[PDB]
Write an enzyme that holds these catalytic residues in place. Structure first.
Site, PDB file in Angstrom:
ATOM      1  CD  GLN A   1       2.575 100.130  20.656  1.00 13.38           C
ATOM      2  OE1 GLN A   1       1.987 100.405  21.699  1.00 13.38           O
ATOM      3  NE2 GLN A   1       2.381  98.965  20.071  1.00 13.38           N
TER       4      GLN A   1
ATOM      5  CB  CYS B   1       1.229  97.496  23.704  1.00  9.31           C
ATOM      6  SG  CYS B   1       0.497  95.830  23.501  1.00  9.31           S
TER       7      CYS B   1
ATOM      8  CG  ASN C   1      -1.782 103.705  24.535  1.00 10.51           C
ATOM      9  OD1 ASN C   1      -1.080 102.712  24.466  1.00 10.51           O
ATOM     10  ND2 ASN C   1      -2.878 103.896  23.764  1.00 10.51           N
TER      11      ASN C   1
HETATM   12  C1  LIG Z   1       0.495  95.620  21.758  1.00  9.35           C
HETATM   13  N1  LIG Z   1       0.892  96.527  20.948  1.00  9.35           N
HETATM   14  C2  LIG Z   1      -0.041  94.340  21.308  1.00  9.35           C
HETATM   15  N2  LIG Z   1      -0.542  93.551  22.286  1.00  9.35           N
HETATM   16  C3  LIG Z   1      -1.082  92.369  21.986  1.00  9.35           C
HETATM   17  N3  LIG Z   1      -1.626  91.569  22.942  1.00  9.35           N
HETATM   18  C4  LIG Z   1      -1.687  91.758  24.329  1.00  9.35           C
HETATM   19  C5  LIG Z   1      -0.871  92.646  25.025  1.00  9.35           C
HETATM   20  C6  LIG Z   1      -0.955  92.715  26.378  1.00  9.35           C
HETATM   21  F1  LIG Z   1      -0.172  93.571  27.038  1.00  9.35           F
HETATM   22  C7  LIG Z   1      -1.893  91.996  27.096  1.00  9.35           C
HETATM   23  C8  LIG Z   1      -2.687  91.152  26.400  1.00  9.35           C
HETATM   24  F2  LIG Z   1      -3.584  90.379  27.079  1.00  9.35           F
HETATM   25  C9  LIG Z   1      -2.633  91.019  25.034  1.00  9.35           C
HETATM   26  C10 LIG Z   1      -1.032  91.924  20.647  1.00  9.35           C
HETATM   27  N4  LIG Z   1      -1.442  90.790  20.002  1.00  9.35           N
HETATM   28  C11 LIG Z   1      -1.139  91.025  18.717  1.00  9.35           C
HETATM   29  N5  LIG Z   1      -0.564  92.233  18.527  1.00  9.35           N
HETATM   30  C12 LIG Z   1      -0.140  92.813  17.196  1.00  9.35           C
HETATM   31  C13 LIG Z   1       1.070  92.068  16.814  1.00  9.35           C
HETATM   32  C14 LIG Z   1      -0.502  92.830  19.749  1.00  9.35           C
HETATM   33  N6  LIG Z   1       0.013  94.049  20.025  1.00  9.35           N
END
Ligand SMILES: *C(#N)C1=NC([N]C2=[C]C(F)=[C]C(F)=[C]2)=C2N=[C]N([C][C])C2=N1
Length: 215
Positions: A19, A25, A182
């Site tokens: 990523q 993600c 991941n």
């Molecule tokens: C990734 N990389 C990422 N994820 C989240 N939040 C997230 C992702 C998810 F699949 C499920 C969730 F409940 C929460 C992020 N929040 C901020 N950032 C950095 C910009 C994240 N990166």
């Protein structure tokens, strides 16, 4: 359910992706799930496009984060169920800059009609996975920045902050575990995967599990 399952052994899982410096993600979790389901639905294994979601799904927030459940709804409701191939909509956000969406010119690589959200129960998640394939999950990944291998047992489990893909489990092992793909390259963890203990809601793994429905 069987004692152990690993969908990698079925050939259903694409290579581990990268990523980069983007909070994408959630897109890698959703698209990896679609890739697996598309294979299991009787098609060749095909790499599909995270960038389609990062750039075009305006319910989610690009490199600032998102949710797999919203991504699955965007695909169906805004994109006619289409998931583009990686080659035709390649990943461009590794340095943290998501390009503007383009609607023209991509190649459909898979079609979905919906998604399922699973009960907040590790046993029921495992039983569904055993039959139907890999499951997208939200996790608290805050303890994952030192993982080098093994089964993790005392992860911080406080806030969902990442999205990943359950590909299997092993209930036979001395510490039962989940197998998680991941999006941090094969140079993190066990060739890009982490094992976390199963049965204690490690990393809040049961809280937000889902999978696409190919159709
Ligand atoms: C990734 N990389 C990422 N994820 C989240 N939040 C997230 C992702 C998810 F699949 C499920 C969730 F409940 C929460 C992020 N929040 C901020 N950032 C950095 C910009 C994240 N990166």
């Amino acid at each position: 359910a069987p004692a152990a399952v690993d969908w990698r052994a079925r050939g259903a899982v694409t290579a581990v992706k990268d990523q980069g410096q983007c909070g994408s993600c959630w897109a890698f979790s959703a698209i990896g799930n679609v890739e697996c389901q598309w294979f299991l639905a009787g098609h060749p294994l095909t790499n599909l496009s995270e960038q389609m979601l990062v750039s075009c799904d305006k319910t989610d927030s690009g490199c600032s984060g998102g949710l797999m459940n919203n991504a699955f709804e965007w695909i169906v409701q805004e994109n006619n169920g289409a998931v583009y191939t990686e080659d035709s909509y390649p990943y461009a956000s590794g340095e943290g800059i998501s390009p503007p969406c383009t609607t023209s010119g991509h190649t459909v690589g898979a079609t979905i009609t919906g998604h399922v959200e699973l009960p907040q129960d590790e046993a029921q998640i495992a039983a569904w996975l055993a039959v139907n394939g890999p499951v997208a999950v939200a996790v608290d990944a805050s303890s994952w920045m030192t993982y080098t291998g093994g089964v993790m047992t005392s992860c911080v489990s406080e806030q969902l902050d990442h999205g990943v893909l359950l590909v299997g489990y092993n209930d036979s092992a001395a510490v039962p575990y989940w197998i998680i793909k991941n999006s941090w390259t094969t140079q993190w963890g066990e060739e890009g995967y982490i094992r976390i203990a199963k049965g204690s809601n490690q990393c809040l793994v049961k809280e937000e599990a889902s999978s696409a429905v190919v159709g």
